[PDB]
Amino acid sequence: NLLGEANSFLEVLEQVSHLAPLDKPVLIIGERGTGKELIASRLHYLSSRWQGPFISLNCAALNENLLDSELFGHEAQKRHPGRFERADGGTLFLDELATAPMMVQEKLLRVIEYGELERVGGSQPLQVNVRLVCATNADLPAMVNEGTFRADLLDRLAFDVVQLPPLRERESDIMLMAEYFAIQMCREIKLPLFPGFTERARETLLNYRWPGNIRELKNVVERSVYRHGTSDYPLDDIIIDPFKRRP
Numbered sequence: 001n002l003l004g005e006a007n008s009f010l011e012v013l014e015q016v017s018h019l020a021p022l023d024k025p026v027l028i029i030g031e032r033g034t035g036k037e038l039i040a041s042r043l044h045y046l047s048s049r050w051q052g053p054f055i056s057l058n059c060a061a062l063n064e065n066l067l068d069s070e071l072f073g074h075e076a077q078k079r080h081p082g083r084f085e086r087a088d089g090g091t092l093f094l095d096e097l098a099t100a101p102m103m104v105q106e107k108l109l110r111v112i113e114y115g116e117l118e119r120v121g122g123s124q125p126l127q128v129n130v131r132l133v134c135a136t137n138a139d140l141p142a143m144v145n146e147g148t149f150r151a152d153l154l155d156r157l158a159f160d161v162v163q164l165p166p167l168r169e170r171e172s173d174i175m176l177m178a179e180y181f182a183i184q185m186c187r188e189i190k191l192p193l194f195p196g197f198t199e200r201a202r203e204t205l206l207n208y209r210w211p212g213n214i215r216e217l218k219n220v221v222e223r224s225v226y227r228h229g230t231s232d233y234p235l236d237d238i239i240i241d242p243f244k245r246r247p
């Protein structure tokens, strides 16, 4: 579910509505917990491929050799397909791209341009039709300067860039989502009503940097509402760090 009405956030949805119909690769820039996969997804369902598959993959998770074959597959009942084939006629979401190895990056470029996967075993190359979407919170141009990311790929990958505003730059929305989250939590722990946040809880919420953004805000709130466990008076104690053993 998409929440938030801050200008920056709205301008993004607008950008997304126009980009989605195209087949050009899209690049999303943003911190963790900012909704990258959601946005990526939104692109898919608003596109013409909305009926094709929507695939995902977190590059940072696999080791070089594993990611390579996990992306373009390999010869295994008789063959192990890659996310590209599994996304054929659909969209492929590559998260944490900045972590992909040069080998893969280079290999990844060819596919984008040539629209085909290379293959061995006396088998002809594979033709794929995939709309690409990638996310990262890194400074790719910076990485191109350190030679850690291929400049040619960047030129090509980045048909256009979507940049999700971190939570701290949307303040307008911090109380809005906290309220929403608090309320879902009340429904689960069966509280009659959400009693609201004292000024202190607000001060806290609005002053935190929210490094984990929306995912963090959510967890902090549910946790907080739980510790409070009552509808008799406003929530005052915001548990940012579950490791501090309050009082």
Ligand SMILES: Nc1ncnc2c1ncn2[C@@H]1O[C@H](COP(=O)(O)O)[C@@H](O)[C@H]1O
Pocket: 001, 002, 003, 004, 031, 032, 033, 034, 035, 036, 037, 038, 214, 215
């Ligand atoms: N507009 C939004 N409304 C509610 N939850 C969101 C929103 N955007 C992101 N999230 C949460 O943020 C997390 C993912 O963001 P990301 O790290 O970019 O994939 C997910 O747990 C979401 O469900």
Ligand SMILES: [Mg+2]
Pocket: 036, 037, 095
């Ligand atoms: Mg994600």
